[PDB]
């Protein structure tokens, strides 16, 4: 041996949307240390169970630097589910979510599973992006959307388990 599946996932988005905490909360680390700041890549493993089976999730978190342009394509191209992540505290993050959707469409694969993750939903008092307007983006592009707090610990575990179910249901279809 167990596991019995391996999903490769990717986190992408504007810097400081909190991509990296969103991870660190899912993978369950006790600590803050990461290489995202300095390198622009970090990585985490977590196996979960879904309808009984072991599912190993490899989660890459990418931060765009052009420094490693080639390598990070390799992650896009090889990714099974990618989470697009904005800050509801910040518009352009949300505006860019389209831009990323480009990359994903342009650099990544033709059937990839996709999920818009509206992060920091906890801090409503600094809230510039309406959720309603969040869902509409998603629905336009026919992708799932979800509001999320790496810090209040809201919907992060669900966001992943949901994306993992979506990956598996697709693969079980090719029995």
């Amino acid at each position: 041996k167990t596991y019995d599946y391996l999903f490769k996932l990717l986190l992408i988005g504007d810097s400081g949307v909190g991509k990296t905490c969103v991870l660190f909360r899912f993978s369950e680390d006790a600590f803050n240390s990461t290489f995202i700041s300095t390198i622009g890549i970090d990585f985490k493993i977590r196996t979960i169970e879904l309808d009984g089976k072991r599912i190993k999730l490899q989660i890459w978190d990418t931060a765009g630097q052009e420094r490693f342009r080639t390598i990070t394509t390799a992650y896009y191209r090889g990714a099974m589910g990618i989470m697009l992540v904005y800050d509801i505290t910040n518009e352009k993050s949300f505006d860019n979510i389209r831009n990323w959707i480009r990359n994903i469409e342009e650099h990544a694969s033709a059937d990839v599973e996709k999920m818009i993750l509206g992060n920091k939903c906890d801090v409503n008092d600094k809230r510039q992006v309406s959720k309603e307007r969040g869902e509409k983006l998603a629905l336009d592009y026919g992708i799932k959307f979800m509001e999320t707090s790496a810090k209040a610990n809201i919907n992060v575990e669900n966001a992943f388990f949901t994306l993992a179910r979506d990956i598996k249901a697709k693969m079980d279809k090719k029995l």
């Binding site: 290489f35 970090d42 990585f43 390598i71």
Partner: protein
Amino acid sequence: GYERLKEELAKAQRELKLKDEECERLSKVRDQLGQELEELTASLFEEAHKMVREANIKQATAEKQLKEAQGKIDVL
């Protein structure tokens, strides 16, 4: 140019086909190399964190044990 266009559109068509065939090969080996880099870098991160955690795990025990004596001196 009936024989010129019926000839060249065989060579030109082949070029696109030759490359089509050449593309899959080029893109096959780019995906193959990318997996191998995935699993390589997967291991390096996994260790790098593994190492760094243990350097922090001890730092906590030492500092933890110091709060165990540091509060009783500041209590009095």
